[PDB]
Paper text:
We selected two trimeric scaffolds, the designed two ring helical bundle SB175 (domain 2) and the T4 foldon (domain 1), to proceed with based on the screening results and previous experience with these scaffolds. This combination of trivalency and receptor mimicry could be a useful general approach for combating viral escape and antigenic drift.
As an alternative to mAbs, we previously computationally designed two classes of minibinder proteins that block the SARS-CoV-2 receptor binding domain (RBD) interaction with its host receptor, angiotensin converting enzyme 2 (ACE2). Here, we sought to develop constructs containing three minibinder domains that could simultaneously engage all three RBDs on a single S protein, and by virtue of this multivalent binding, potently neutralize SARS-CoV-2 variants.
Residue numbers in the entry:
A (entry chain A): 27 to 66, 81 to 143, 165 to 172, 186 to 242, 264 to 620, 641 to 644
B (entry chain D): 200 to 242, 264 to 298
C (entry chain K): 1 to 75
Amino acid sequence: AYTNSFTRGVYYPDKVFRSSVLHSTQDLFLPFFSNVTWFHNPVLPFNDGVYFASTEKSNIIRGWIFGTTLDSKTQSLLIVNNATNVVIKVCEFQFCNDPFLGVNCTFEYVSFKNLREFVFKNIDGYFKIYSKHTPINLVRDLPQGFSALEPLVDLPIGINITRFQTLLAYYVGYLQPRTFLLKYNENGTITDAVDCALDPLSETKCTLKSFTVEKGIYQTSNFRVQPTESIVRFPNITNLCPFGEVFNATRFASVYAWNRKRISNCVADYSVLYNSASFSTFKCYGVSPTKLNDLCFTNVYADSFVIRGDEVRQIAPGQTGKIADYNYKLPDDFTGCVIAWNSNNLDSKVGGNYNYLYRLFRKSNLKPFERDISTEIYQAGSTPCNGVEGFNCYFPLQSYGFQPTNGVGYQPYRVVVLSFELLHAPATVCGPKKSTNLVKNKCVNFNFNGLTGTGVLTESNKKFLPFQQFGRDIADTTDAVRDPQTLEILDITPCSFGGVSVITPGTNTSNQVAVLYQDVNCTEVNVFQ
Amino acid sequence: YFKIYSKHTPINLVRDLPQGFSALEPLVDLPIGINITRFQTLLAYYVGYLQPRTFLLKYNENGTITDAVDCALDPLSE
Amino acid sequence: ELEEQVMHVLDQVSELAHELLHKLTGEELERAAYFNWWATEMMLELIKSDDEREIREIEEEARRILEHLEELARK
Ligand SMILES: *[C@@H]1O[C@H](CO)[C@@H](O)[C@H](O)[C@H]1NC(C)=O
Ligand SMILES: *[C@@H]1O[C@H](CO)[C@@H](O)[C@H](O)[C@H]1NC(C)=O
Ligand SMILES: *[C@@H]1O[C@H](CO)[C@@H](O)[C@H](O)[C@H]1NC(C)=O
Ligand SMILES: *[C@@H]1O[C@H](CO)[C@@H](O)[C@H](O)[C@H]1NC(C)=O
Ligand SMILES: *[C@@H]1O[C@H](CO)[C@@H](O)[C@H](O)[C@H]1NC(C)=O
Ligand SMILES: *[C@@H]1O[C@H](CO)[C@@H](O)[C@H](O)[C@H]1NC(C)=O
Ligand SMILES: *[C@@H]1O[C@H](CO)[C@@H](O)[C@H](O)[C@H]1NC(C)=O
Ligand SMILES: *[C@@H]1O[C@H](CO)[C@@H](O)[C@H](O)[C@H]1NC(C)=O
Ligand SMILES: *[C@@H]1O[C@H](CO)[C@@H](O)[C@H](O)[C@H]1NC(C)=O
Ligand SMILES: *[C@@H]1O[C@H](CO)[C@@H](O)[C@H](O)[C@H]1NC(C)=O
Ligand SMILES: *[C@@H]1O[C@H](CO)[C@@H](O)[C@H](O)[C@H]1NC(C)=O
């Protein structure tokens, strides 16, 4: 059940005296001729403020509950008019599943024939109540006429309200941002009002700041066609970075002699590796695995080598150990991703694979990304080796023993480290740029290979040169673009806009008006072109 | 960015350059980041040098450049 | 699981001996380097072997070496 709000829900927006003046104001109001819900008792939403009205004979409605959870979890606002004074409290109240009246608190305050109207809104923590009480002679509807509601209560509570309920017929409407022209009389009261968004005539009255409009044509606001989707297009990907030559390689280098491959001047798709789910380790430093794909670099360096499963932990910033110190050192400010996977069924041999080596001895530790492939005999004692292995002298390298039956810590892992840098260079290594389809003959937003804008895209009859991407008008604005995937030329026509004027005989003749939409196709807005 | 523009035309002339107007089109654009201060030709040819100048370029119906004015050549061009 | 248990002890010997390569000097340094090498040599010798008795012999010697190295680590 719904009723007609007519011109109800208007209240004095402030405490300022004004007389014999038309004042334009913007605030939360009940729209004129809106749909008001008619109740004869559920919990309702509060939204941005609520208009409440009731018709009465014998004081059945007693009060209201405002709050959020309303179940002894959070504070709520309880307003009850019991026999004499109104009692208002804010507490962590426990309410019934169906609250009614018979015949931790932070705030407390104590203050058909009968029509009572109220406005409940909460602004910056202040719960503001406006009200009016008038006599009526009406049973099954709301009266048509104008009145303004006066401020009665202002509670500095700071309480969140999202729902409310009525305590015991009544009507509920909702407030929203609207512009009104309010007419004040000699006695400072409001005698009329115009809802500036109700219709072209009301809009004209507000525009001219008057309740009376003479014969003529007046401009009010503007008409504009809005865009819908966004058309983003880029050139074909064409190629991809040779990551398959790193991760799917048939041979990996020893850790003491790690193999660095330089990747550059290519499209770097990092989504393929990320979502392969074939890696035991995938740890990124300085970059996120889900953002890396959208970053551009000067160089990508892929360092590949084989180590034991237990040694994988050494391939990280701030690490020490046989690998971190003597074979493969990363910096503490390292930027890049460390990826590793189990290769026990590939690199292991029955009896042990001894073709892999690591550095066991070294005079000092390695610098970041430094390599040492020397085979000089290490001197452990004070006696010189003279290049000869023996007592107190060791060959600097030691072999691995990878076999299928090794425990996981001793199983071989293939490790790839992707190190990133950006210099003064253009930075030619970027991930794939995804694109969408092409929409024509509609108002859209767009981005053509970096050229952004808005308008209607249509097929052109133009000629661009083989090296030209877009054209310009005498105004130096863009009037055409080339499609990066299709190589067609499109024209760009700005989405229709123009002023709107209202034609009136004058409000002393008729409230009927005609509306003119300037410089526009009627197909886009009796219709006369 | 190392930018290369070029044009190839037929001529009938042995000991000079032809007098007439043509425009050179972009062919290559190399994102290198390399400092260049000297160059050499690998095997007659002519060498001139570029400098900041203002030009008025005349475009035709077909989007091509058919003429140009060097705004600093003389009072009339200016 | 015996081979893994022995490898564990050998790993402890090598890792401690590794740290000592940056702490000790003179003869004590030479010894840590020797024991470092030995532990890794045993890792491969253990793989290329059979007979529990030979495996146990490595376990015992490796444990003795680990205890020895701790005498240097605490100095
Ligand atoms: C508003 O009420 C009228 C009846 O007066 C009804 O026809 C119309 O559909 C209602 N609008 C909405 C949105 O409920
Ligand atoms: C209304 O309720 C309050 C308690 O909230 C009570 O103190 C007051 O006396 C009641 N009013 C009457 C007339 O009983
Ligand atoms: C009582 O209510 C206040 C609200 O300001 C709250 O901060 C306090 O934690 C509540 N007491 C308990 C025990 O929850
Ligand atoms: C209401 O809740 C929001 C969180 O959703 C909070 O930011 C805001 O400050 C709260 N307002 C009051 C009056 O508690
Ligand atoms: C209210 O307005 C009337 C005129 O409509 C005026 O006569 C009356 O005096 C005003 N009230 C007061 C207190 O002046
Ligand atoms: C490696 O090969 C597998 C199997 O074909 C494939 O799914 C994966 O994407 C490849 N990795 C790279 C970097 O090409
Ligand atoms: C892009 O690929 C499509 C096929 O999906 C092809 O028809 C089109 O010509 C290609 N465009 C370019 C610029 O390569
Ligand atoms: C409307 O026009 C008539 C003349 O035909 C005039 O007598 C009357 O006062 C006018 N009303 C208003 C509000 O101007
Ligand atoms: C209105 O649209 C029709 C159909 O596209 C067109 O023929 C007519 O010229 C348009 N009117 C104006 C003023 O452009
Ligand atoms: C060229 O050398 C200068 C130093 O004289 C330096 O500042 C500049 O960045 C260099 N440019 C390139 C592309 O290397
Ligand atoms: C080039 O210009 C001539 C006029 O000088 C025109 O006739 C010709 O159609 C243009 N070329 C193309 C493809 O339109």
